[PDB]
């Protein structure tokens, strides 16, 4: 008789399935493992996904993606991550294809297979690959690569096909470093393995081989892939100090859209501070010289992906948190103070009538001249630029171009202003403030009228758009562009209490 499960399905147990996943400004990890192709970004949404795609023992799932366990101050947890490639060495061709888990049962009739390769001028006729009786995909790979190696082309001199079971991917690398413009050609038989390997469907790009672009330009390409981020870890082996300075300086020049992190152990703080002091905002943290079971720099990376920036109650001061499963890198008063004055977030320890506490002491970034110099404040600036740019992008996708006279400012301001309402009813802005002589003069002379400093003193912001005419690289026509200036009100948050108990 027809079962009750056809109509009502009471999935008992720990069924779960919260659809409330949606907190942007996610962590990016620039890893070195060539499991990720060098030039595309995969946005994983759970530790299970990172365990599936990436290695089960790789730091990408063990060290990273254990940040999904972070419980924020209220209830929230991060729910999305992204990864990219460092581009360690000079790039050889690494043509990667078909994450689909195709099985040998599909290729169980591919005797004397024809796997043609289109290298442009070197379109080949590689055949004689027996997969009807093979020994798993990883030794189908051997037969394939040897049949490539019969052709004495310098590129296809020692071909290398790999089968990664975690991704279930067939990756044709090849031999010739320096220039790797390759592809795969399609044949016509059951024995043919061009699209059966998924090397011609859509899951190949070329992975063209270039030279190394180690510190900076790789991150620039990664950002060009996807602007959806909030902070990039740049994990793996500790980078060189000079390339670290370059990495910090590049996206100090970017200023917007990024907080970036530097992992160094103790006694590197003075030199690193001297090289990187200033340069917008970078998170320098003291690493425990004993072990590395804590991913240290994940402290900014976790909280940032748990704020949710849509419900009132954002901002967290970024200092007094209670990160578990982490090692106490600083446990002495003199050590704590010497780490300080050189920035450095030392995740220390204390005691209070017993117990031991924890803390993620200090949230100064580096800054110093005029920057946000505070992870809370810089975090809010990041998501303000994110939301405003998204609102303008939707405005322009809806209707292209704004009449740049006086109504264009009207649509621009009217689209921007709900973002400002969210900011006011999020905790990022501040109702009050006591803009004083220096701040009064500064606000007056930046762009605002004489009586604009009043508004920031009572409301929290002053936003105005003008239009400017500029010329581009090739556009002979003088183009016009918007210019919105918005005066952030900052916002303080106490971190020290001083008492004066009298009369005992």
């Amino acid at each position: 008789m027809i079962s009750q499960s056809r109509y009502i399905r009471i999935i008992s147990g720990v069924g779960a399935g919260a659809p409330v996943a949606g907190r942007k400004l996610i962590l990016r990890v620039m890893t070195t493992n060539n499991v990720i192709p060098p030039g595309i970004v995969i946005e994983f949404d759970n530790s299970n996904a990172v365990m599936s795609y990436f290695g089960a023992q790789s730091e990408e799932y063990q060290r990273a993606a254990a940040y999904f366990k972070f419980i924020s101050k209220s209830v929230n947890s991060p729910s999305s991550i992204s990864f990219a490639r460092w581009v360690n060495t000079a790039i050889a061709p690494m043509v990667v294809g078909d994450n689909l888990p195709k099985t040998i049962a599909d290729f169980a009739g591919f005797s004397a297979g024809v796997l043609t390769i289109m290298v442009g001028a070197a379109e080949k006729n590689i055949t004689a690959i027996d997969t009807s009786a093979a020994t798993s995909m990883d030794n189908v790979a051997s037969i394939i690569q040897t049949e490539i190696r019969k052709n004495t082309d310098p590129q296809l001199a020692q071909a290398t096909v790999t089968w990664n079971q975690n991704t279930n991917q067939f990756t044709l690398v090849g031999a010739t470093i320096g220039t790797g413009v390759l592809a795969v050609a399609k044949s016509a038989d059951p024995q043919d393995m061009s699209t059966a390997l998924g090397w011609s469907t859509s899951n190949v790009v070329n992975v063209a081989g270039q030279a190394a672009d180690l510190p900076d330009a790789a991150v620039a390409k990664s950002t060009n892939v996807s602007n959806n981020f909030g902070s990039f870890l740049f994990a793996g082996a500790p980078l060189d100090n000079d390339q670290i300075k370059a990495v910090s300086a590049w996206n100090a020049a970017q200023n917007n859209q990024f907080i970036y992190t530097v992992a160094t152990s103790l006694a590197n703080l003075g030199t690193l501070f001297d090289l990187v002091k200033g340069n917008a905002g970078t998170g320098l943290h003291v690493l425990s010289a004993t072990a590395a079971n804590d991913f240290v720099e994940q402290c900014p990376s976790e909280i940032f992906a748990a704020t949710n920036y849509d419900e009132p109650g954002a901002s967290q001061n970024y200092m007094y948190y209670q990160f578990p499963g982490r090692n106490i890198t600083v446990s002495d008063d003199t050590v704590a103070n010497t780490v300080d004055k050189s920035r450095g977030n030392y995740i220390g320890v204390t005691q209070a009538n017993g117990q031991q506490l924890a803390f993620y002491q200090r949230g100064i970034l580096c800054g110093g001249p005029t920057d946000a110099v505070d992870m809370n404040v810089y975090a809010n600036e990041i998501w303000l630029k994110s939301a405003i740019a998204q609102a303008l992008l939707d405005l322009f996708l809806n209707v292209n171009a704004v009449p740049a006279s006086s109504t264009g400012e009207a649509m621009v301001l009217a689209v921007l202003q709900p973002v400002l309402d969210k900011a006011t009813a999020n905790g990022t802005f501040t109702y009050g403030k006591e803009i004083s002589a220096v701040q009064q003069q500064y606000i007056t002379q930046v762009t605002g009228d004489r009586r604009a400093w009043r508004q920031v003193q009572t409301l929290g912001y002053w936003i105005n758009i003008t239009f400017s005419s500029y010329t581009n690289n090739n556009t002979g026509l003088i183009e016009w562009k918007a210019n919105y200036t918005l005066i952030y009100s900052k916002g303080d948050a106490i971190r020290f209490v001083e008492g004066s108990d009298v009369m005992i």
């Binding site: 006086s406 709900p418 508004q455």
Partner: protein, 150 residues
């Protein structure tokens, strides 16, 4: 430019639910006031026995009345917004938040937010001669902001 003219005005509207990245209203009425606002209160005083005045800063929300020429693109959009927000029988009303930006020709801009429609005619009334009567619409916003001078 301290000039008293306002010919050259415009009213950008955005509704979070109904008109995200909303419309333009530029066809204001000629007989009635294009943009009008009832006087704000902002305080209230009471005199004691010996003359001690007591000042109360009552929180209040400003109001705007926009008169528009009826059966027009901006006006049709306004009527659509009001009909979406209004509540009748068997229809579902979307409680949204509207934001109105006026860019007067002298350069100054006034933006008001966290508001909602408060009135409307809902039927194109016909005047005596045959002309359509200008349709007024009233909003009550929560926050007002002045940006830009001259």
């Amino acid at each position: 430019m301290i000039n008293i003219s306002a010919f050259g005005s415009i009213c950008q509207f955005t509704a979070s639910r109904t008109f995200p990245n909303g419309f333009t209203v530029t066809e204001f009425a000629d007989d009635a006031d294009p943009i009008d606002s009832p006087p704000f209160t902002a305080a209230d005083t009471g005199v004691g026995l010996n003359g001690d005045m007591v000042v109360w800063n009552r929180a209040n929300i400003l109001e705007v009345v926009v008169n528009v020429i009826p059966n027009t693109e901006g006006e049709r959009n306004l009527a659509v917004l009001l009909d979406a927000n209004r509540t009748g029988k068997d229809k579902s009303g979307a409680r949204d938040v509207v934001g109105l930006v006026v860019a007067m020709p002298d350069g100054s801009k006034i933006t008001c937010t966290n508001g909602t429609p408060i009135d409307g005619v809902l039927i194109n009334a016909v005047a005596s001669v045959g002309r359509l009567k200008t349709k007024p619409y009233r909003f009550r916003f929560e926050k007002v902001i002045k940006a830009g001078t001259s």
